[PDB]
Design a protein around this motif. Sequence first.
Motif, mmCIF file in Angstrom:
data_model
loop_
_atom_site.group_PDB
_atom_site.id
_atom_site.type_symbol
_atom_site.label_atom_id
_atom_site.label_comp_id
_atom_site.label_asym_id
_atom_site.label_seq_id
_atom_site.Cartn_x
_atom_site.Cartn_y
_atom_site.Cartn_z
ATOM 1 N N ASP A 236 -4.275 5.008 3.254
ATOM 2 C CA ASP A 236 -3.164 5.360 2.355
ATOM 3 C C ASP A 236 -1.978 6.051 3.029
ATOM 4 O O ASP A 236 -1.479 7.075 2.552
ATOM 5 C CB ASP A 236 -3.647 6.158 1.114
ATOM 6 C CG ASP A 236 -4.271 7.536 1.414
ATOM 7 O OD1 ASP A 236 -4.412 7.973 2.564
ATOM 8 O OD2 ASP A 236 -4.638 8.208 0.428
ATOM 9 N N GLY A 237 -1.503 5.474 4.129
ATOM 10 C CA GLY A 237 -0.371 6.034 4.834
ATOM 11 C C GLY A 237 -0.711 7.062 5.885
ATOM 12 O O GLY A 237 0.170 7.823 6.296
ATOM 13 N N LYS B 223 0.842 -1.183 0.000
ATOM 14 C CA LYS B 223 0.000 0.000 0.000
ATOM 15 C C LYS B 223 0.889 1.248 0.000
ATOM 16 O O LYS B 223 2.035 1.189 0.452
ATOM 17 C CB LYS B 223 -0.933 -0.024 1.213
ATOM 18 C CG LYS B 223 -1.638 -1.362 1.425
ATOM 19 C CD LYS B 223 -2.806 -1.266 2.407
ATOM 20 C CE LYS B 223 -2.452 -0.511 3.684
ATOM 21 N NZ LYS B 223 -1.261 -1.093 4.366
ATOM 22 N N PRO B 224 0.405 2.373 -0.545
ATOM 23 C CA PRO B 224 1.272 3.550 -0.707
ATOM 24 C C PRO B 224 1.734 4.167 0.605
ATOM 25 O O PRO B 224 1.053 4.084 1.632
ATOM 26 C CB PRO B 224 0.386 4.532 -1.483
ATOM 27 C CG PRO B 224 -0.571 3.666 -2.210
ATOM 28 C CD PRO B 224 -0.866 2.547 -1.272
ATOM 29 N N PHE B 225 2.933 4.762 0.544
ATOM 30 C CA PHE B 225 3.532 5.572 1.612
ATOM 31 C C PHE B 225 3.766 4.776 2.895
ATOM 32 O O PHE B 225 3.219 5.088 3.955
ATOM 33 C CB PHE B 225 2.700 6.828 1.891
ATOM 34 C CG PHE B 225 2.910 7.929 0.894
ATOM 35 C CD1 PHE B 225 4.104 8.033 0.199
ATOM 36 C CD2 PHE B 225 1.914 8.863 0.654
ATOM 37 C CE1 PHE B 225 4.302 9.046 -0.719
ATOM 38 C CE2 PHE B 225 2.106 9.880 -0.261
ATOM 39 C CZ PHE B 225 3.301 9.969 -0.949
ATOM 40 N N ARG C 91 7.052 1.836 4.708
ATOM 41 C CA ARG C 91 8.385 1.260 4.663
ATOM 42 C C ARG C 91 8.347 -0.165 5.191
ATOM 43 O O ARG C 91 7.442 -0.531 5.945
ATOM 44 C CB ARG C 91 9.371 2.079 5.508
ATOM 45 C CG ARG C 91 9.611 3.486 5.014
ATOM 46 C CD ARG C 91 9.919 4.439 6.159
ATOM 47 N NE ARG C 91 10.983 3.937 7.017
ATOM 48 C CZ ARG C 91 11.814 4.708 7.705
ATOM 49 N NH1 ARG C 91 11.730 6.027 7.660
ATOM 50 N NH2 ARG C 91 12.754 4.140 8.455
#
Lengths: 49, 31
Positions: free
Chosen positions: B27-28, A13-15, A17
């Motif tokens: 989304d983060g 999933k985005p963003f 680590r």
Amino acid sequence: NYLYRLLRKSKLKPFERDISTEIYQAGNKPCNGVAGPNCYSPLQSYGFR
Amino acid sequence: ANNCTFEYVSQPFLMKNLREFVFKNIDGYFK
């Protein structure tokens, strides 16, 4: 000194680590912490020349 | 202390005393 990963169990999933290094297994026989048959380290260097 | 990524200090969070919370991970972001 600069590393990247080949393969992971699932997509990202985005963003975020991933820091921890675990030996992936793609077979019935477990790795048990040993990089033997069907066991690969995830991270290696770029090797710039 | 073992890869300190983020810190946060703010107003007190916990203050016939029913309380409600919703935590979602999109989304983060954490809301």
